[PDB]
mmCIF file of C-alpha atoms and ligand atoms in Angstrom:
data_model
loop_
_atom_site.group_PDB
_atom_site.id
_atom_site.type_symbol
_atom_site.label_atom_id
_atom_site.label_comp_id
_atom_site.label_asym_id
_atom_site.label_seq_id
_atom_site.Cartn_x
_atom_site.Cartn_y
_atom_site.Cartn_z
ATOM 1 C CA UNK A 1 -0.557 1.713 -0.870
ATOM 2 C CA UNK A 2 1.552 0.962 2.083
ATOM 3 C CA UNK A 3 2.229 -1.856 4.652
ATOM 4 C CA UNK A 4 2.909 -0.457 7.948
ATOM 5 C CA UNK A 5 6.223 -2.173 9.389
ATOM 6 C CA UNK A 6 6.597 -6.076 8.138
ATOM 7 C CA UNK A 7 5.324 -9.488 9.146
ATOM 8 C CA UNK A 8 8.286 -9.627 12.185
ATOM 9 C CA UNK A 9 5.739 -9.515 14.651
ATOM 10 C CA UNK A 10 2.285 -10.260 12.681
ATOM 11 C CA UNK A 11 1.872 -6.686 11.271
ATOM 12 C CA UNK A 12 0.678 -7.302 7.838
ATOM 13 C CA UNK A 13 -2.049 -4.028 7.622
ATOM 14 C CA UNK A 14 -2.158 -2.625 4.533
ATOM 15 C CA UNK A 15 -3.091 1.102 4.237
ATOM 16 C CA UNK A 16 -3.662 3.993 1.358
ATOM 17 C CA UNK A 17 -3.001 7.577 1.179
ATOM 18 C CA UNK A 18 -1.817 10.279 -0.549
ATOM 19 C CA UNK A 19 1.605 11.252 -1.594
ATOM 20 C CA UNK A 20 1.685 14.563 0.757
ATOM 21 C CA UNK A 21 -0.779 13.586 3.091
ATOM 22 C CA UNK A 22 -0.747 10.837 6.217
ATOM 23 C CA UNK A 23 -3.908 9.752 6.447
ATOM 24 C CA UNK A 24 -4.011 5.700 6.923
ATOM 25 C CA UNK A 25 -6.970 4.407 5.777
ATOM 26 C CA UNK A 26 -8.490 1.132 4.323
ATOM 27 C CA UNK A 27 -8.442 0.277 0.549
ATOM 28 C CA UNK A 28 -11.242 0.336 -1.210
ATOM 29 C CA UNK A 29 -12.331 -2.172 -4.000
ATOM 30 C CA UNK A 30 -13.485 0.039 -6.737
ATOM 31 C CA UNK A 31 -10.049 2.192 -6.446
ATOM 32 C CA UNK A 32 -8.003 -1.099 -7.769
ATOM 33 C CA UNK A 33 -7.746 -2.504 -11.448
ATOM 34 C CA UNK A 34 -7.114 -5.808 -12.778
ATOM 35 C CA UNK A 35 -4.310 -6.873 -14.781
ATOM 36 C CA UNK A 36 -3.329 -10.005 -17.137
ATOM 37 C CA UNK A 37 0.417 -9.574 -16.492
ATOM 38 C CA UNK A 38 2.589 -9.790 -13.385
ATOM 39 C CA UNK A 39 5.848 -8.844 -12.158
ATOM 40 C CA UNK A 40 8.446 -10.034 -9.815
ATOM 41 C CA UNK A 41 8.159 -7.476 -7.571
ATOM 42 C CA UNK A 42 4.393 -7.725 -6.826
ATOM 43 C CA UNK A 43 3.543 -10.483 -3.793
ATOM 44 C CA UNK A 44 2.012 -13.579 -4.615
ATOM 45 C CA UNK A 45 -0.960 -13.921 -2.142
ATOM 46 C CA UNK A 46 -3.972 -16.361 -2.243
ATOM 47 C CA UNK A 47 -7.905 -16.055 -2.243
ATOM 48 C CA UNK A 48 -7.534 -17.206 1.678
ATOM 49 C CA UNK A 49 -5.701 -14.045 2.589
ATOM 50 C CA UNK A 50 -7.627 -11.702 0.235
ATOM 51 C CA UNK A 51 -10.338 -10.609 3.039
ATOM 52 C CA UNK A 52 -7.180 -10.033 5.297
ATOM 53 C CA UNK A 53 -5.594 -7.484 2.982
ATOM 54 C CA UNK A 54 -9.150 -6.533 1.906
ATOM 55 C CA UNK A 55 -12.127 -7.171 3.986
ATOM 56 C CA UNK A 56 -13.827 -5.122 1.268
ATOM 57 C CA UNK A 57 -13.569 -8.106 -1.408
ATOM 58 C CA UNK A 58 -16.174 -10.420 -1.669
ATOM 59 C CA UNK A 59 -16.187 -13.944 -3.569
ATOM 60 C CA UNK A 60 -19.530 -15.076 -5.028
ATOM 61 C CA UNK A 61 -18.747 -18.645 -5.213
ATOM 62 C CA UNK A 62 -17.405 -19.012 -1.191
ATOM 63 C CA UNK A 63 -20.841 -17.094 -0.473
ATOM 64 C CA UNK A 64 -22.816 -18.788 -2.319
ATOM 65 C CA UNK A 65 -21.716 -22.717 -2.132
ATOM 66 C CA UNK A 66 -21.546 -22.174 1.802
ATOM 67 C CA UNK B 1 -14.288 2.839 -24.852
ATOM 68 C CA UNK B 2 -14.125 0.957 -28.201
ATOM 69 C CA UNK B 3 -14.357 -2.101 -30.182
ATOM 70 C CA UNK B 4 -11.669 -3.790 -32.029
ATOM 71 C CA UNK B 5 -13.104 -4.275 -35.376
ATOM 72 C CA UNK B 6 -16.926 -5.221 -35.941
ATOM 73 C CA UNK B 7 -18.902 -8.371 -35.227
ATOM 74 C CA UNK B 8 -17.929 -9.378 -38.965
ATOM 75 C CA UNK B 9 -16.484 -12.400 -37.807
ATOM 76 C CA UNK B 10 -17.674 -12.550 -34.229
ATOM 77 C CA UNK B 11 -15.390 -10.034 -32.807
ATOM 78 C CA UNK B 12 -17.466 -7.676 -30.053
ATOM 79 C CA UNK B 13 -14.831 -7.882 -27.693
ATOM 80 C CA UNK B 14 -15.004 -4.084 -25.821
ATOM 81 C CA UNK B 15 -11.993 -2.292 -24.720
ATOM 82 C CA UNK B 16 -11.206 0.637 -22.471
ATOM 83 C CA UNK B 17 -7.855 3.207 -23.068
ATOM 84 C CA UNK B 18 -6.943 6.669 -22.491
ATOM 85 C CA UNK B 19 -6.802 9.092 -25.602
ATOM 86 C CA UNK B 20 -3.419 9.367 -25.573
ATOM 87 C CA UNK B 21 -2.278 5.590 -24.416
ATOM 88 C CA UNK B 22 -3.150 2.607 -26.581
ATOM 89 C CA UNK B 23 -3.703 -0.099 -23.872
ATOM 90 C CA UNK B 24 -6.105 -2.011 -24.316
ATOM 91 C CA UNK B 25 -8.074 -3.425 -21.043
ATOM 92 C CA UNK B 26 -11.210 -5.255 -19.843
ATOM 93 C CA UNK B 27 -13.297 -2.344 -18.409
ATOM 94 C CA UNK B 28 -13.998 -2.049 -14.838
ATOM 95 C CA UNK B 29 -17.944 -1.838 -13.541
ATOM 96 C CA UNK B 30 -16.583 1.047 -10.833
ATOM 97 C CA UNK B 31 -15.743 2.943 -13.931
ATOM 98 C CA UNK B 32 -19.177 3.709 -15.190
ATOM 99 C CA UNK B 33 -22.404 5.398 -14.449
ATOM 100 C CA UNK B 34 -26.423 4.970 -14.687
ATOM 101 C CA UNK B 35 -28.294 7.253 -16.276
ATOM 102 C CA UNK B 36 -32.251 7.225 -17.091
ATOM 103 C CA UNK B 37 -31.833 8.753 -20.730
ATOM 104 C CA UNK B 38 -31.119 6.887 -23.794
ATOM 105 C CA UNK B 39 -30.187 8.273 -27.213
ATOM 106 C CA UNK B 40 -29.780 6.398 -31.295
ATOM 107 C CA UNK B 41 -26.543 6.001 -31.190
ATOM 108 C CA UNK B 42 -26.068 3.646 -28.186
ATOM 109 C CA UNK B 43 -26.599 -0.304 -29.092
ATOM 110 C CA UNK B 44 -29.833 -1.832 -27.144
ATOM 111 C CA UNK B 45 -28.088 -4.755 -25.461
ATOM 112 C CA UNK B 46 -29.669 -7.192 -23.429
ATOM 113 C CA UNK B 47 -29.246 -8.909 -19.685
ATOM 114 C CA UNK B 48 -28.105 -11.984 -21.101
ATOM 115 C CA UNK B 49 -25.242 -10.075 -23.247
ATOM 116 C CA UNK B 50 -24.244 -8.278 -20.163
HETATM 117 C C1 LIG C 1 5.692 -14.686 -6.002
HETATM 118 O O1 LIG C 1 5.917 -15.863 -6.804
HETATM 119 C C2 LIG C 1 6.292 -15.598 -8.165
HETATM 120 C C3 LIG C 1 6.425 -16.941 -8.845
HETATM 121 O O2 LIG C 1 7.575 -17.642 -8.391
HETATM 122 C C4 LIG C 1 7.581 -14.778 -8.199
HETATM 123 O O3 LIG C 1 7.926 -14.439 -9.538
HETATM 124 C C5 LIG C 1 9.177 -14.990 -10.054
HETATM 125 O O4 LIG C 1 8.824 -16.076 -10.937
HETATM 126 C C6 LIG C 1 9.945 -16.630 -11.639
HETATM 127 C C7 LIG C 1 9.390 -17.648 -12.608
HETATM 128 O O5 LIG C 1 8.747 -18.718 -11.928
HETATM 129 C C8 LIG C 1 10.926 -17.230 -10.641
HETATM 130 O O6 LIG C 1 12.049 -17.757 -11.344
HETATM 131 C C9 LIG C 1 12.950 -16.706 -11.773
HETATM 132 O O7 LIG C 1 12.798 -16.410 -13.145
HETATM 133 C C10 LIG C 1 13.510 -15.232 -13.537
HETATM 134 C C11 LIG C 1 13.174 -14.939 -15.002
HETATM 135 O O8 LIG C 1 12.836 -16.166 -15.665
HETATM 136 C C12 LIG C 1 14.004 -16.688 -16.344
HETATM 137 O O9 LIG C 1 14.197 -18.066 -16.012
HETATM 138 C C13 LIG C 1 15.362 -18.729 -16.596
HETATM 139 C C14 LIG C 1 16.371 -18.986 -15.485
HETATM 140 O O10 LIG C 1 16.771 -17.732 -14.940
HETATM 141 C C15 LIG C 1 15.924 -17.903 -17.769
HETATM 142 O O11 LIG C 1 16.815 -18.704 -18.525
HETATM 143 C C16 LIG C 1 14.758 -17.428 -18.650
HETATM 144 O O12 LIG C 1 15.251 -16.834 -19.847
HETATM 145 C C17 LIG C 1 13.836 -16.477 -17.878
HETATM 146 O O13 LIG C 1 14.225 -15.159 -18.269
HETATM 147 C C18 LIG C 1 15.039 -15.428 -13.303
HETATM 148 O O14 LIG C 1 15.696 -14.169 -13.402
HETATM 149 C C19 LIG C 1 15.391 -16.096 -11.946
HETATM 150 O O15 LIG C 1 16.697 -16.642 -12.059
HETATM 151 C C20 LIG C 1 17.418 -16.509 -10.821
HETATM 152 O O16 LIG C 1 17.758 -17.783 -10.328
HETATM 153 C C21 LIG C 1 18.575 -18.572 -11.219
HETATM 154 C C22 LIG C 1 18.752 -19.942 -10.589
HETATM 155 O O17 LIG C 1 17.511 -20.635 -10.681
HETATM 156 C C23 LIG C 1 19.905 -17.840 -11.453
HETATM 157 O O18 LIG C 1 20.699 -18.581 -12.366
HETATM 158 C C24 LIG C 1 19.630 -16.434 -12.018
HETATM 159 O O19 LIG C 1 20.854 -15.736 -12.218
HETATM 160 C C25 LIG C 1 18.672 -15.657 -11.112
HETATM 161 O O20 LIG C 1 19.405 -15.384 -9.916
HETATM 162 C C26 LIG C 1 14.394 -17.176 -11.512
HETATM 163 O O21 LIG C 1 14.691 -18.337 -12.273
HETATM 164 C C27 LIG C 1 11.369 -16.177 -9.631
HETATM 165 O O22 LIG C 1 12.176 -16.782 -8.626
HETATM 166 C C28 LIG C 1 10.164 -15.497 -8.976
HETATM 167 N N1 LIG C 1 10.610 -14.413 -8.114
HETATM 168 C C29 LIG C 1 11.067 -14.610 -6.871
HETATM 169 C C30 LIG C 1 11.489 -13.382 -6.122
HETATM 170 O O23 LIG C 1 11.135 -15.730 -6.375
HETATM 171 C C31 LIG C 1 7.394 -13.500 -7.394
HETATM 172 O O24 LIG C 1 8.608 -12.759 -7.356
HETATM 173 C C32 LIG C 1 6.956 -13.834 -5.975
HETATM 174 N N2 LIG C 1 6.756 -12.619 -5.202
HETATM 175 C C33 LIG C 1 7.403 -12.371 -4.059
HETATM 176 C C34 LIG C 1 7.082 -11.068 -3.390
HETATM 177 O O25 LIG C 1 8.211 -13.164 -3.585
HETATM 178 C C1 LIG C 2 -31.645 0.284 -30.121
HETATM 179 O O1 LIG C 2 -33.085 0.349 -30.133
HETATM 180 C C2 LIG C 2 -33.629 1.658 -29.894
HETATM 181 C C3 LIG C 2 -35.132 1.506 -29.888
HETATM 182 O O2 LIG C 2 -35.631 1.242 -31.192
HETATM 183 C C4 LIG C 2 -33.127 2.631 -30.959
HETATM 184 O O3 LIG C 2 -33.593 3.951 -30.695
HETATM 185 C C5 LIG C 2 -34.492 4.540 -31.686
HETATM 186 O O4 LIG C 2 -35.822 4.482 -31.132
HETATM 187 C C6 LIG C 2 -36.804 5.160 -31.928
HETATM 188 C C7 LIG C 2 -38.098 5.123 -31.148
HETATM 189 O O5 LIG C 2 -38.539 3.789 -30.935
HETATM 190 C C8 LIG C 2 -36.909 4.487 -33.291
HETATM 191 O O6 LIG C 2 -37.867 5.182 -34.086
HETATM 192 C C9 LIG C 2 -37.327 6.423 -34.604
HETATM 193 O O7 LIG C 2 -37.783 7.542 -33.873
HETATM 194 C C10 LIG C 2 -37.092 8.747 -34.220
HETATM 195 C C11 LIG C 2 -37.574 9.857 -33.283
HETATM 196 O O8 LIG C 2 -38.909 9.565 -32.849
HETATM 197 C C12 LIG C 2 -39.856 10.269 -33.688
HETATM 198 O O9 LIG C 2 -40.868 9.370 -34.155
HETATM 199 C C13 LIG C 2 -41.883 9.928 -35.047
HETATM 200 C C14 LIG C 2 -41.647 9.370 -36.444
HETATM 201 O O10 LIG C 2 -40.359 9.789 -36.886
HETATM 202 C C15 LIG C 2 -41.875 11.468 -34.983
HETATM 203 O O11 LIG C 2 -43.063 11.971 -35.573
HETATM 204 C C16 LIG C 2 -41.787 11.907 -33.513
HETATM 205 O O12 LIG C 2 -41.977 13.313 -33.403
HETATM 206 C C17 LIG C 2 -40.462 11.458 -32.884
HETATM 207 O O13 LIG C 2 -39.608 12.602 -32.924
HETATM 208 C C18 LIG C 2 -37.334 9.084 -35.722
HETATM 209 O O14 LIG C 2 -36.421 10.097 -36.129
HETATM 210 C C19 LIG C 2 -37.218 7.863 -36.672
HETATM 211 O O15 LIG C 2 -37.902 8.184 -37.876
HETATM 212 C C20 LIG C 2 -37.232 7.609 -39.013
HETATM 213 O O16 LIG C 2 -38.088 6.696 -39.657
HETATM 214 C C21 LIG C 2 -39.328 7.264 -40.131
HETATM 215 C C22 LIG C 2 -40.169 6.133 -40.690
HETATM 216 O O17 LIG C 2 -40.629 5.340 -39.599
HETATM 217 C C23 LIG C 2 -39.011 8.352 -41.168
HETATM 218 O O18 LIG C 2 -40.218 8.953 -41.607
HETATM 219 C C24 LIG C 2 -38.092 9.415 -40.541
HETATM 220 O O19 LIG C 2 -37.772 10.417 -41.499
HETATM 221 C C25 LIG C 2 -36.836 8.773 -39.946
HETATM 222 O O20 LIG C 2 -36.073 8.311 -41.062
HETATM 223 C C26 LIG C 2 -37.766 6.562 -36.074
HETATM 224 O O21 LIG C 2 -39.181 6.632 -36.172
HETATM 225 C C27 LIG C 2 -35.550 4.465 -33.980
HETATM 226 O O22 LIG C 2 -35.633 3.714 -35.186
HETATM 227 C C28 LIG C 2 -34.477 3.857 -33.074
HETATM 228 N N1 LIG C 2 -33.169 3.965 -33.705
HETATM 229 C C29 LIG C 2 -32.740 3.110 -34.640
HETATM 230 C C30 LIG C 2 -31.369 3.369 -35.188
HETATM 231 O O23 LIG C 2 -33.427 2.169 -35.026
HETATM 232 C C31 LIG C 2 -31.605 2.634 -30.972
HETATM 233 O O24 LIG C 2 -31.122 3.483 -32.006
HETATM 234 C C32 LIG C 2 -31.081 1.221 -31.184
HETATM 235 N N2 LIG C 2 -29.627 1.209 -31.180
HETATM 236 C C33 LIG C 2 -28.902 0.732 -32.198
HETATM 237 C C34 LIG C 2 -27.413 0.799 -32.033
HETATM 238 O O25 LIG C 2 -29.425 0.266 -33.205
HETATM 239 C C1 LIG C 3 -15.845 -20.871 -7.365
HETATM 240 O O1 LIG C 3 -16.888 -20.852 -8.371
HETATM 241 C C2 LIG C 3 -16.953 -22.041 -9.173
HETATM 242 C C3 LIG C 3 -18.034 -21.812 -10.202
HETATM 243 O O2 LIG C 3 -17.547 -21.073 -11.314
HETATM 244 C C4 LIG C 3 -17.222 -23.251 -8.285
HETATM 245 O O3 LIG C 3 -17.231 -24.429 -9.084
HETATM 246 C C5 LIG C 3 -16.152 -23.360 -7.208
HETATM 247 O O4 LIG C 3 -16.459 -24.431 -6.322
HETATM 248 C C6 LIG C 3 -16.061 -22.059 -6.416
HETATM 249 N N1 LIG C 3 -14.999 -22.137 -5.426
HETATM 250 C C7 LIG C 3 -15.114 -21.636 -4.191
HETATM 251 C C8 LIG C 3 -13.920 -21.806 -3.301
HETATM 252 O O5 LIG C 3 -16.134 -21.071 -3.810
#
């Protein structure tokens, strides 16, 4: 997983590929895993942003109370 | 996928590792499949379990 360019001018897209191949495309739920620990190097986002990273990610709760 | 220990002292708690790896993690519901076939050896758990 990638981020093309920085925030400097609003460019915060996030893109996966391969390793030998350039093929920018979105990130898919199901190829991620969830872990208890965290490092210093990983960004520290918020459930606001999630959908922006990942319009793929749903929350029951936000669906469901409104 | 495994159990650490037995329900002896209320201790189902399910696990997922590679066979090489021990590291123990909460499994993933991407990571497994239906199928319409049941055998014995594969506990009969419930919805409310799930
Ligand atoms: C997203 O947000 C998280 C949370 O802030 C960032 O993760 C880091 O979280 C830690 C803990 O809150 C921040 O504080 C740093 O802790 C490091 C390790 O903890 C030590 O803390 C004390 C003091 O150092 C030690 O005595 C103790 O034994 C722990 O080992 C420290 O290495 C850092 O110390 C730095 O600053 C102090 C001055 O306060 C200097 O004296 C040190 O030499 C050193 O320079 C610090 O205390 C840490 O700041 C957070 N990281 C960052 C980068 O801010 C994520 O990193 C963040 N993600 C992104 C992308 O920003
Ligand atoms: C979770 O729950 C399920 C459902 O009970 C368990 O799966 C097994 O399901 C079968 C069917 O309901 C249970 O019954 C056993 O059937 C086996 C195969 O079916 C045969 O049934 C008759 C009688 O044997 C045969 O004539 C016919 O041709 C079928 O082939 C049998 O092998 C078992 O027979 C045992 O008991 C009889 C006495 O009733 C003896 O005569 C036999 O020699 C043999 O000892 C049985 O009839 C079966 O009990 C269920 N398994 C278990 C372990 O209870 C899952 O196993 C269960 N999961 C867990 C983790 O418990
Ligand atoms: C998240 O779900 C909990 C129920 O476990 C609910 O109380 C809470 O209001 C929800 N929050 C949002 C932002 O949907």
């Amino acid at each position: 997983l990638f981020t093309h360019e920085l925030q400097n001018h609003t460019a915060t897209e996030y893109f996966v590929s391969s390793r030998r191949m350039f093929e920018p495309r979105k990130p898919t739920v199901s190829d991620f895993v969830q872990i208890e620990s965290c490092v210093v190097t990983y960004v520290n986002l918020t459930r606001d942003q999630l959908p922006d990273v990942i319009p793929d990610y749903i929350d029951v709760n936000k669906t469901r109370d409104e």
